[PDB]
Amino acid sequence: LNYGSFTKEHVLLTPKGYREWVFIGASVTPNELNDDKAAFPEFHNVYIDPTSWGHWKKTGEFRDGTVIVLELAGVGSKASPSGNGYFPGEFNGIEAMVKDSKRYPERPGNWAFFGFESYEAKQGIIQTDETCAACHKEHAAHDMVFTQFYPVLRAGKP
Amino acid sequence: KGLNYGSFTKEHVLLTPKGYREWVFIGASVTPNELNDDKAAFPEFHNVYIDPTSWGHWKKTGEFRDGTVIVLELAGVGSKASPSGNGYFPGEFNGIEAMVKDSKRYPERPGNWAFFGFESYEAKQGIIQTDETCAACHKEHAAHDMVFTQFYPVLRAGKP
Numbered sequence: 001l002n003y004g005s006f007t008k009e010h011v012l013l014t015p016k017g018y019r020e021w022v023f024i025g026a027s028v029t030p031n032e033l034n035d036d037k038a039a040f041p042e043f044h045n046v047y048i049d050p051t052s053w054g055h056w057k058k059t060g061e062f063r064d065g066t067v068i069v070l071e072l073a074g075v076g077s078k079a080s081p082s083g084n085g086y087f088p089g090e091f092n093g094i095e096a097m098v099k100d101s102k103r104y105p106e107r108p109g110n111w112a113f114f115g116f117e118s119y120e121a122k123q124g125i126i127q128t129d130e131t132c133a134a135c136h137k138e139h140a141a142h143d144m145v146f147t148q149f150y151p152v153l154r155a156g157k158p
Numbered sequence: 159k160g161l162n163y164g165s166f167t168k169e170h171v172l173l174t175p176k177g178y179r180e181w182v183f184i185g186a187s188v189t190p191n192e193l194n195d196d197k198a199a200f201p202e203f204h205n206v207y208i209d210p211t212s213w214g215h216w217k218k219t220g221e222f223r224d225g226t227v228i229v230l231e232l233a234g235v236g237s238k239a240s241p242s243g244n245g246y247f248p249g250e251f252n253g254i255e256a257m258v259k260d261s262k263r264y265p266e267r268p269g270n271w272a273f274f275g276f277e278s279y280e281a282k283q284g285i286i287q288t289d290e291t292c293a294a295c296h297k298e299h300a301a302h303d304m305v306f307t308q309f310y311p312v313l314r315a316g317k318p
């Protein structure tokens with residue numbers, strides 16, 4: 001069973017309950033290390049939908065219907081009782097990508113990339129290839145997903 | 159009634175948890191070695207999970223029930239620059255640590271919390287910790303019932 005809800009025009013309605021999907025990794029690009037403004041501010045928490053996670057554990061490939069959600073959060077602080085570093089604050093928004101060779105036959109890897117204007121938006125905004133796919137295609141380790149930063153995925157494949 | 163996710167020896171020690179990466183993620187932090195004189199206490203990334211049943215109870219109550227298991231999985235820094243910018247990006251897993259709240263199993267421990275370290279991923283069970291090794295620090299600084307929920311935006315968004 002596929003976890004996206006889509007319009008007929010193949011646009012991803014804003015996902016709900018993605019925090020109960022399978023987390024695959026977190027990174028941080030702080031503003032202070034990026035001319036005070038990282039491109040994607042400031043802690044990517046990444047989830048894959050449960051059905052595609054099951055397929056991933058079995059095959060090491062992204063199924064048709066795969067939905068991946070990246071959730072942005074602020075740096076809330078840089079020192080805590082456990083030491084110095086980066087610690088999360090408040091949520092900032094989400095981005096998503098969907099693999100579907102049937103909905104997106106002309107897109108690279110059959111991936112559609114979605115930006116979201118806000119958490120209250122009813123749907124994502126499909127992106128042209130120059131805005132997202134070009135970088136992912138050039139640099140992601142496996143099928144346009146940056147699996148070099150997802151140790152859960154790497155440990156879960158057969 | 160929900161499932162129990164923790165398993166215990168006769169001495170009420172938590173056996174090394176499996177499948178916890180399919181529990182509900184509540185937040186991630188990073189304490190890099192390079193920002194702590196080349197020796198972080200807990201290297202480096204921290205990915206934190208709460209078991210699914212206590213998450214269900216949390217969404218309803220904003221409290222940690224008896225039987226709550228939290229797993230902190232440690233990972234290395236894999237890199238410091240990527241196409242998305244500069245910062246910290248994870249590498250490989252380092253180990254795990256856990257805490258279990260249970261008023262019948264641990265009646266005299268602070269907060270009824272048992273803190274567990276793990277010698278390796280292949281170990282049969284955790285090692286229960288003295289109050290001074292872990293509980294003392296958690297008690298001093300955690301926002302709610304010895305869990306550092308100030309760093310778990312999933313929990314804060316999840317309370318009713």
Ligand code: HEC
Nearest residue numbers: 027044070095096097113114131132135145146240241242
């Ligand atoms: C256009 C607005 C987008 C959208 C919707 C997404 N990307 Fe990227 N991305 C980049 C890197 C280095 C990572 C992993 C490390 C990190 O977290 O910074 C990501 C991660 C994602 C994901 C998670 C799944 C994955 O493929 O890792 C998603 C869903 C996502 N992004 C959506 C790098 C870049 C870019 C290089 C400059 C560009 C441009 C984009 N991303 C653009 C977009």
Ligand code: HEC
Nearest residue numbers: 080081082187204230255256257274291292295304305306
């Ligand atoms: C003794 C070896 C332990 C064990 C088994 C754990 N701790 Fe800690 N802890 C501290 C801080 C500031 C945080 C949150 C920020 C961060 O990521 O560092 C934590 C978090 C945890 C968790 C997650 C659940 C939670 O309560 O937040 C777990 C399971 C955990 N730790 C295990 C601070 C400290 C200390 C002060 C220096 C000390 C000492 C410990 N922790 C010791 C332990």
